[PDB]
Amino acid sequence: TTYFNYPSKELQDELREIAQKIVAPGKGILAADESGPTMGKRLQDIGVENTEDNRRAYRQLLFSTDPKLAENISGVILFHETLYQKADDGTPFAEILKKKGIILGIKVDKGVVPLFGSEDEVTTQGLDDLAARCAQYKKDGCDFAKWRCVLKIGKNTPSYQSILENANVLARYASICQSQRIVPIVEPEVLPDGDHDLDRAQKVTETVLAAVYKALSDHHVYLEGTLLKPNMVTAGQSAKKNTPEEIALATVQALRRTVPAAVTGVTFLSGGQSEEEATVNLSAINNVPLIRPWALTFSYGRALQASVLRAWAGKKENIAAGQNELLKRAKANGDAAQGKYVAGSAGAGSGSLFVANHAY
Template sequence: MNQDKLIKTAQAMVTGNKGLIAMDESNPTCNKRFAALDIPQTPKMRLLYREMLITTPGLNEGINAAILYDETVRQKLSDGTPFVKAVKNAGIIPGIKLDMGAKDMAGFPEEKITEGLDGLRERLAEYSEMGLRFAKWRAVITIDDGVPTRRGIVNNAIILAQYAALCQEAGLVPIVEPEVLMDGKHDLKRCFSVTEHVLHTVFDQLYKQRVLTEGIILKPNMVLPGSNCQDQSNTEEIAHATVKCLMRTVPASVPGIAFLSGGQTSQQASERLNAMNANYKSEMPWALTFSFSRALQYPAMDIWNGKEENSKRAQKALHHRAICNRLACSGEYSEILEKSISSANERDLEFL
């Protein structure tokens, strides 16, 4: 394990109030999103879409790193440039999603366990040869009556730790993603309790697996009430609960925490990230940033709609969201700035 390399890469992923773009949707997930917009669900269209994203002018003004999917890292852009090289050319660090998806856990059918450890050492060696510098693994935790169980949390934490150790052995920074889903009727207090338990367990297992915490990135959920909860907490309450939970559970040695968006709207994700940094940045030992998928991509995907003539406008929308989230990482995002950036983009488009 090259500790210095791991630490430098992890720090580079979260520096400068910038974050990550998660463009690692599996083919079935990407196809589902395309189907909702009547976009053809083909390898060519998936490539054209991701090419549009990564060739967005100025994307690295708000993005340090991009999480890719296995299909994507083996593809080439329209001009023949290998996709991984195109990411590097954009001034962005390339990484890869490694897990094979969440499946029903044997004996605990209401809970999920993430698969993909078989053959992982060999896959990591190949990805390292391709020039990828980090990886991601997602565990899924559901809140409902009687779940999550202690067994479900521990099993997922053990697998996350094993994955992280293998990544560091291969010289790749592991993104550790234990996602407590926002689906359900639970309130903010219940999400806090479960998230705290999950993070304590994950870091316990990382320690037992001898994972270097200075060489990882944590990708957690924000502490949120369930999407079907009648009492939807406000932005300040969510920011306070989330930072309090992280301060209780995440070692100061971790260089950065990059939130998933988890079904929040683009503006909700930005507003809540901004409130955390605006109110608590001076108290936090780690960078607090973003690793959004839908909250970054959806406006662009909706505009693009599978049509080349919409690409420039879609890229403007993606750049807009990247800049909004960069501002949220410094606690400077606001609704006024949101609208002013959008208006400036529209003026620019008039001259295209």
């Protein structure tokens, strides 16, 4: 389609400015958008019962950290309930974060659903009344959004069907967010599950990303006002491990071949990578001997929080200890984002954070 309308200058500026801020040098995103159920799995793991109040308590720990955190954390992705919660003293979480100069993000998808007749593949739902939801979220202090699509590597997957549909849904989501003054983070996650090699992973990723950007173009999405949140290119979780060097080259090559320079930044997901791997891999990515026209940073969930949870262990007397773990890993990742992380300098970290059985 050649006859279309570019967003107004006012809107372009606003969206570009938000995206630019999220990927400012030495900064990345803390993904704290776990739903009741998922968060519950994390709590149980440390003997803590999954109650609304326990969830609020944990988020309070994260959110009351020394303002030093804002040096490495540009933004936080929230789950719906958290956006409306308050600290012990009655201060809204939103207010605490804003005061520290952190940008608020919101998870807007409604999870995955099966593609009938496919070989166990999925798409993501949540477009219904998204514009209205976005207008409310924006008023309540949110400036960016998150939506997760899942692609699986198997004998015949991802299929053309899956690639086409996930690419299209991502474009619909992005368009809507942009209409309502919200920066969309596009997240086409190629799952690590399986025993395929790095070559297969690279080819899959390249195929997926090409479809994503063709769909964004078809739906006239303003690229400068978006971020991408892709998987790093690695072999399957059940295959031999690659070196940071190998991962970094395959990843940067895949992005160079598919993601336009107009895209403001890339905020990597960690998948099942340990806290340490996630950092070391990001650092190597920022040392690849190829032109890298976008900011390459992090958007980490488990990879920023496993040690935090372990340290806290549900006790008030361990709050400072938990916050300390967070500060350490944020700094480490901030260094990685500048390609200056020294392996093992932030400590041993966690073990594998791999949880299989996503989408379907």
